[model samples]
Target: GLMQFTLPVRLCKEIELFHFDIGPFENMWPGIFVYMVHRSCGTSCFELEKLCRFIMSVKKNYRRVPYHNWKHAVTVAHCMYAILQNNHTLFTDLERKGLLIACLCHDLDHRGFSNSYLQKFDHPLAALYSTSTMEQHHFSQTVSILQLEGHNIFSTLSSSEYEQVLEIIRKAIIATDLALYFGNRKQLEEMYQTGSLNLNNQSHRDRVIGLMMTACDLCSVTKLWPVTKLTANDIYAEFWAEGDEMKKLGIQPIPMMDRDKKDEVPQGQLGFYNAVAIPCYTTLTQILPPTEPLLKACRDNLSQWEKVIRGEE
Candidate 1:
C-alpha cells in the first residue's frame, strides 16, 4: 500500500469541475481529480499520480447500475470540487481534502437498490451495518480501495494527520444518508437562525461538510431541466429494476417503485423535488451563498416537473 509513482503526470493542468456538458467519463475523472487535489492541497506529483491511479481503480469497481454508477460518483465529487474552488477560504486545507475525498467515495459499489430492500431481503451488507446500510457499505468500499497497493494516497501525510483526515472522510461519507440529512438540515438551520453557525467551530465544520455531501449526492436536481429529466430517467429505471426483482421474489414493491404505475413518475419526481431536493439545496444556499445556482436550478427543475405532471411535457 506504500508504493511510489514511477511515471510522470501527463494530463493537462486544468479541469472544470462543474462543466455542465461534460459527462463524468471514467477515463477523464482520474486526471481531473488529481489536478483538483494538486491545486487545492498542493500535493506532490508523485502523490497526485498515486491518488489518480487509486481513483481510476475505484471507478473500475463501481457497478454499471443506472444512476449510481461511476458517473454519479464523479459528478458528486465535481460538485464538491466546484464548491471548494469558490469557498476554499471557508475551510482549512485538510477539511477541504476530506470533503472532496468523501464526495468521491460516498456511493461506491451501489447495487441499484435501496436500504429498505436490503433490510427486507436480509442482505449481508444490511446485516453487517444494521443502519445507514448503503452509506456504511460505501465507506467500507472506500477504505478497501485505499488499502489496495499504491492506493493509499494519504500515506505521505503525517501519522496523526492521516488519522484525522480519515476520520473526517468516514463521517462525511456516512452523512450522505438522506435519513441523516433531515436532522442535519434542522440542526444547521437552527444554528443559522440563532446566528450560532460558525465554520471555525469543529462540530459546525463537520455538520456543514455532512450537509455539503448531501448537496453533492443529489446535485442533479440542481441542474437544468433536460439534465434533471435525464437523471430521473436513469434513477427510476434503476428503481424499477429493483421492483422487478422484488416481483420475481413474490413481493410487491411500493407504488413509486413499481414501473407499471406510469402516471406516478412525474408526480413522484415533483414530490421528491418539493420534499427532498429543493429543501436540501435551499438550506445549502443559506449556508453557502455561492450555491444559489443549485437552489435556482432546483426551482427551475421543479417547475418543469410541475408541467410534466400536468401533462405538459
Candidate 2:
C-alpha cells in the first residue's frame, strides 16, 4: 500500500508481523525485527526498502548458534522495543533508533562461543580486539552490513548524523559484553543511590542506555519461569558446545559449561541472578520507575530458580 507488497499474502505477512503472538511457525518471527525497526526508526529516518534489506542481512549474518543467534538478537531487540514503550520520553529519537538497532545486531556473526573461549583458542577475532573480543567483532559485522549495497538504512541521514548514530550503536553493542556490565552497574547504582543521576545530562543518559542494554541482554532472566528455563537450556547448549570443544583439546571446561555437570545449572543461574540480574534490574527500577514491573518479574524468576536449587520442585 505505502511502498509495495505485492499480493494479499504479503500484506497479510506485514499485518501479522509482530502481534506478540507465541505460537507455532516460529520461523515468522524474523519479520518482528523489521516491523520494530520500522516503528522505531520510522519512514523519515529510514526508507522501507533499505531498512528491510539491512535487517535481513543483519539476521543472515548471525550464525545459527544455540544462544547468540538471530532468535536471541530478535528477542533482545523485542525487549528493547517493549522497554522503550514503557519509558518513551526518557530517550531522544536518535537514541531510541540507535538502541534498537544496536540490540538487533549486537551479536552478529557470533561463533556460538564466549569471548574467553575464543581467546583461549587464539581465534582471529580475539587477536583483532584484545578485549571485548566477540563484541568488537559484532559491532564490526554490523558496520559491514551497513556498508553492503542497498543496506544503508541510515541513508536518509547526513554524513555526520550517520557517524553519530554509528557511535551509539557501537557503544551499546560493546556494552552488551558482561565484562563491562559490573563497572557500569556499580557506577549507575552509586550515582542513582546518591541521588546524583541527571537524565538531562548527556553522560548520565549514556550510562543509563548502557545499563538498559544489559537489562535487555539478560531479559530472559526476567521472563516467566517456563520461558526463562527454555532460554537457559539454549544458553547451556552453547556453553556445552564450547566445553565439548575444550574436552577435545584435552582441557577441562568449567562446571557451568560442562555437560556432565548439568545438575549445577540451577545453582549457576542462582549465582547469576544474584550477582548480575537482580542487582541490574534493582538499580534500573530505581532510575526508571516505569521498569518496576521488570524488577518484579526478575525477582519472581529468581525465587523460582532458588526453589529449584533447594529441591523444592
Candidate 3:
C-alpha cells in the first residue's frame, strides 16, 4: 500500500533539471533532503521511505523564523546539490554525503539571536558547548533526528563507514560558524596558493571541506543577481527583527543586526561582496574550478550593489 503512494516531489529529476529561482522551494522542502541523500548515498527502497519520513520530521522541527526556516534549509541543500552535480567531482562519496546532510541541517532551530547575544545574556546554550554554540546545537539536533524511530538513513553503511561519515558531517556542520571562517580561509588559501591542497591528504582535505561549507552557507550571494537580491532581503528582514529584540533587551545591535541601519544594506552588501563572498568563491574554485561561476555571480551581485549604493540601480 505504501509503495502505491505518490511521491511528494521529484528531487532527483529536479536536481538536474531546475535551478533555485524557478523551483518551488517551499513545496519541495518536505522531501528534497532525504531524496537527495538517498540518491547520493544509495539507499534501499524501504530506507528511502524512512528517509522521506526522517527529513520531514527534521523539517517539522525547524522553527518558523524569518531567514532560517525550512525553506532556508532546503535551499542550502539545493546549493550543495548544484555544487556536487556540476561534473567537478571534487568530493569523495563520503565527503559529498556528509556535506549534503550538513548543509541541509546547518541552521536548525536558529532563534534570531547571534552567538554574542547568547553569551552576553548568559544563555544556557552558550555555556553548553562554550564555543561554536549554535552550530553545535544544529549538529546535535541532526543527531537527535537520526536517532528517531525508523529514521537511521545511514543504516546501510558498515559501522566503520558510518563512523567516518558522521565525523566528517560534524566537522562540516561546525565549520559553518563565521567565527571559524578566518582560520579556514588562512589554511585553505595557503594550501591552494602553494598547490599543497591535495585531495588524498586527509589533513589538507579537512580545510577544503571547511571552506566549501563556508561557501555553501553563504550561497545566497553567489546566486544570480535577482535571486541574490531576493535572498538578501529575506535575511535582512530576519536581521532587523533580531535587532528589534536586542534593542528591547537594552543591547546595542551590531551593524548588520541594527534596524536603524536598514538603508545601509545595499552599501554594506558591497563591502561583504568584496571582502567575503567574492574571496570565498574565488579561493574554492582555484581548487575546484567548475565553481568559477559562483565567483562570477558574486562579482555580478557586487556590481549591482554598487549601483544601488550610488542610487543608480
- Whole-model Cα lDDT per candidate? 0.79, 0.81, 0.77
Candidate 1 structure quality by residue, lDDT tens digits, 53-110: 7888788878989889878877787778777776768877677777778887888889
> Against the hidden reference, what TM-scores do the models get?
0.90, 0.91, 0.90
Q: Which stretches of candidate 1 lie over 4 Å from their true place?
A: 1-19, 43-46
**lDDT agreement of model 1 with the native:** 0.79
Ranking by TM-score: 2, 1, 3
Kindly report which residue stretches of model 2 are placed more than 4 angstroms away from their true locations once superposed.
1-27
Q: Candidate 2, residues 11-102: lDDT per residue as tens digits? A: 34433222222223445655655566556556465677787788788878888788888777877887787778778677777887788889
- The true-versus-predicted C-alpha distance at residue 277 of model 3, in Å, is 0.7
lDDT of 3 by residue, 1-313 (tens): 2333223355445554324542554765555565555555445423656767777877887888777877777777777777777744567777766777788788888886778778877899999979999999999998999899898877877899899988998998898898898778878889877877788998788888888888878888866678788888788888887788788789898889887878888878877877788888888888777777777777888898888888887
Candidate 3 structure, TM-score to reference: 0.90
Residue 36 in candidate 1, Cα distance off native in Å: 2.6
Tell me the deviation in Å of residue 52 in model 2: 0.9
